[PDB]
Amino acid sequence: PQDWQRLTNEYRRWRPKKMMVKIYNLQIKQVVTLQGDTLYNNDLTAGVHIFC
Amino acid sequence: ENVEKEIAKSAPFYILENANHEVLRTGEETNFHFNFDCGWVNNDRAYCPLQADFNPLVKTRRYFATRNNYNNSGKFVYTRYSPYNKPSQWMPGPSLGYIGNTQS
Amino acid sequence: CARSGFDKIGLAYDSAPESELEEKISIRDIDNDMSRWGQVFVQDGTNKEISNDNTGQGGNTRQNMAELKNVWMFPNQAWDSTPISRDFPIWVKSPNTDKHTLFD
Amino acid sequence: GSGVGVSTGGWEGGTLFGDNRVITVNTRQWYAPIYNGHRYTKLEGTGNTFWKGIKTPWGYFNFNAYDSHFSPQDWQRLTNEYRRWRPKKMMVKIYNLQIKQVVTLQGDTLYNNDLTAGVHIFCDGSHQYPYSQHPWDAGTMPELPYKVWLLENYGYFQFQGDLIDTSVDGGSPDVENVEKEIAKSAPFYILENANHEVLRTGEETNFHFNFDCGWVNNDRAYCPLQADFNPLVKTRRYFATRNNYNNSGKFVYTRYSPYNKPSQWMPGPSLGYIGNTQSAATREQALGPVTVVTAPPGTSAYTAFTEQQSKTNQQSASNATWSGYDVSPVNCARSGFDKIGLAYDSAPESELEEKISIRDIDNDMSRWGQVFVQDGTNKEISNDNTGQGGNTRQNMAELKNVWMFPNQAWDSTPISRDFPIWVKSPNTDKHTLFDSSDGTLPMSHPPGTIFVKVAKIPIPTQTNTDSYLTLYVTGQVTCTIEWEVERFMTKNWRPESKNDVSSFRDAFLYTVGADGTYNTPERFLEGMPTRRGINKTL
Amino acid sequence: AATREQALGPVTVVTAPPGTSAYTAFTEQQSKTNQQSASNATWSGYDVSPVN
Amino acid sequence: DNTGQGGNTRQNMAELKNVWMFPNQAWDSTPISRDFPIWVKSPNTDKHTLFD
Amino acid sequence: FMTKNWRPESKNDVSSFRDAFLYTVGADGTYNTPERFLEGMPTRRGINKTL
Amino acid sequence: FMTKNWRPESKNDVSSFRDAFLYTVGADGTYNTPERFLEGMPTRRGINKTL
Amino acid sequence: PQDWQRLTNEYRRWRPKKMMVKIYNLQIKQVVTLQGDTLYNNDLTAGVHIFC
Amino acid sequence: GSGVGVSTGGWEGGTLFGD
């Protein structure tokens, strides 16, 4: 909210130049129900598909 | 010859597994760069109507026509605009006066 | 488009995602920019229909002025795009069609 | 070398016609009085108008007209010999400055020259100050090089009287009152914030400018957009015809005539509104084809009510003239209405006679007289099969209002010798196609306005009230514009119509009379308009 | 209509310069300009098709 | 008046037969058959709108 | 922006907001957002543009 | 200034002025000046300073 | 007023660094009363004392 | 150059905001 306020108050116009996105610290968790309870344990060697 | 039969035939179906893309694990990361090509976003306002910007201190050179007798024998009689009312060449921007349906 | 009189009509939106507590619907009321117009009126001639004879007095009454509700694109039009709030979309996908008119 | 007793320059003038360039040098004798008593004051229009603005202790050089730059013959030779022209670069030179003091020693007034008095000269090239100069203003450079030119007082719009009206009382701040806000956010400009020169009699100054602009086309189309084709070949296209006037009907097709062929080229835009002629006695209400009421959403302009459909403040068409500003002419590509929009006088400050000239003559066939649209059969269809016709139906209608549409091509209005050259294009984000029905060339950054005021020399007073010394500035200004031109070439066999004087109705014109009154055209043809004889293959 | 050379088309355009009188023309008394009836205009004018 | 019930009936919706050029319009040109003309002469006029 | 305007421009101050507690969390953690368009700090407020 | 503050600061907008016509000349040329301290745009308004 | 507003809104603190004053375009006028009227005529070779 | 009839300076004004 302040970056917006300071943007609109101090500047005549703006446009984006270039964007950079970074997807990192990935963590893949498995959901298993051992009993009535649900427990969340981390399964290594599971992949995630990412497509731009 | 059935055209609706054809629309359904020529409708696409897309699958994202045709495309080359990354498969990552916990240790891996990825990033993407993009370069915008775009117009601006203007933060400043006009304080004046498009047609109101002129100098009342000078008298205009232009006259406006007036019909006189309301019949076939009539003709336009011309008289000078007021300094405070001057014609303009700048039209209003486009608009559609339809407010949308509120029928409940 | 360029009519600011109707700013209140088109856009109404909520900031709060996934909040069933309250609507909090915000509508764009405030535009002080004078390059956007409230109304446009067109006036096509005298206020009384012309008599077909020479001499004679006026004729049946006639509608001199009218509001133009629908203003399309025309030469020498200049206006300003709507003021945007903090929560708006930045960009929109332009279609991949062959022909495009002015982007506003 | 330099000083009080050597001139800074000399009188330059004339014209140079060339193949690719025309250079018109013009010098005038000008003077600036003390405007408004050296004070900024709120300018309010008398009568009924809501225009409100500032009156400024400044005056300015307005170089925008053709007749100021070209003589009557330079114009004639321009329009006859050249296909198109545009300005390239302008250079103005303000020199031979002389500051005189006005003192009344007795009943008589005597004019004695006070050295060491300055003059402020400011060219706004960035347009940081309101550009209030309008085309079709009477304060441009005189067409007669021997007439002295009184600079015009500068002033600018500030706020709209009926958009500051409601509940603007200053008892307590109303942040939700929008009209209270318009008045708060209205600007106020002072030309003493800007860096500018102060000159004395020995000093001079000059300014250069580089135009970036479109052209001014002097050639006419002899053919309608849709009439250019070869009747010797038969067309391949057929036109549909309904047969039986009922549901069982269908279109039956038959070939166009060789002499009637369809076209892909639409008529250029036009608005069929001729403006209000009601015999209204108020000159300051809006009489114009399109009057535009600018009001922000929350504001109430003059007498306004809420339309209950949209629940927004709106005005009656009669009240809107109070609150709004007309645009004329709107006819654009329709040449049928040429007579409607423009009427103007050449003669400045002459109370002798009106001499109002209206643009009657346009021979250009790329501009259309009327457009008719015809939507189907002349009789309504019966809902049963078989049956005969139905209730009568209106087959054809005139389209009065033609907006912008794909495949439109037209030509701008022919301009006379005395028109404005350019017009300020607004600094708005969005613009459509530039076509001015007054023929002007809109430019993003036109030549920067040159402002002049006379330095304020105080008079000591016991009462300490403001008292200034009464004195004025006279000088010489040389405006030299370089024009980019194109000579025409044609394979046409027949002779073209050249703007001869033989077509003038008045024999003695562009010449002084017995008392020195310079006789000017009262007609549009006598002003030697463009687009006369030079033919343009469509 | 049996006449192939009259204008049958969505938009028929009568090009006449201001002072001219095209075919059978009358003066509209509002603008005092020569105008034509929609039936006569087909004689004097040129259709554009298709306008869709 | 305030309160009250409705009023005279009103036409809510209508077909727009004539759609002129307006901002944010995007469309595609007509499909052409094997036998069409390739090109057309653009007029030598000063002003042109969009070519479709 | 750069301007020769003398008078002060309208800057999107919070003082014009109707709700005092806004853009801040509450007792239960609910982040209070604007329900009005002015409280969303729109553009085109005070910066004047010579026409 | 630089800040990590999330919320918008109070900026000395003119909207808080009580008198609409201010810092501008009148009909007779009288330049209208603030009669109040807020209308004189004081310092130390919105910019927050971590203690 | 706007330079002040933009100053106070956009900046955390300020102080002056260096000032430069320039006194120029000097004009010395004499006040003489030739009659009931007072007339103001410019007398060259009259000095002004300036001391910083 | 210099003398009774040439000005010693000109009107300067405005402001420049910078970082």
Numbering used by the authors:
A (entry chain I), I (entry chain B): 105 to 156
B (entry chain I): 209 to 312
C (entry chain I): 365 to 468
D (entry chain A): 34 to 571
E (entry chain G): 313 to 364
F (entry chain G): 417 to 468
G (entry chain I), H (entry chain B): 521 to 571
J (entry chain B): 34 to 52
Reproduce, without paraphrasing, sentences from the article in which this PDB structure was first reported:
To expand the structural repertoire of determined capsid structures for the diverse Bocaparvovirus genus, viruses infecting dogs (CnMV), pigs (PBoV1), and rats (RBoV) were selected. In the icosahedral capsid, the 60 VPs assemble via two-, three-, and fivefold symmetry-related VP interactions, resulting in pores at the fivefold symmetry axes, protrusions surrounding the threefold axes, and depressions at the twofold axes.
Canine Minute Virus (CnMV) was first isolated from German military dogs in 1967 and was initially thought to be non-pathogenic. Later, it was found to be pathogenic in newborn puppies and fetuses, as the virus was found in the lungs and intestines of nursing puppies, leading to lesions, diarrhea, and death. The high resolution of the cryo-EM maps allowed the building of reliable atomic models, starting from amino acids 34, 41, and 42 (VP2 numbering) at the N-terminus for CnMV, PBoV1, and RBoV, respectively. Capsid structures previously determined for the Bocaparvovirus genus showed disperse protrusions surrounding the threefold axis that do not significantly extend radially from the capsid surface. The more prominent threefold protrusions of CnMV are the result of significant insertions into VR-IV (+1 aa vs. BPV, +2 aa vs. PBoV1 and HBoV1, +4 aa vs. RBoV) and VR-VIII (+12 aa vs. PBoV1, +13 aa vs. RBoV, +15 aa vs. BPV, +17 aa vs. HBoV1). In contrast to VR-III, CnMV’s VR-I is the shortest loop in comparison to the other bocaviruses (−3 aa vs. BPV, −4 aa vs. HBoV1, −6 aa vs. PBoV1 and RBoV) and is located between the threefold protrusion and the fivefold region. Another feature previously observed for the bocaviruses, with the exception of GBoV1, was the presence of density extending into the interior of the capsid below the fivefold channel. This density was also seen for CnMV, but is absent in the PBoV1 and RBoV capsids.
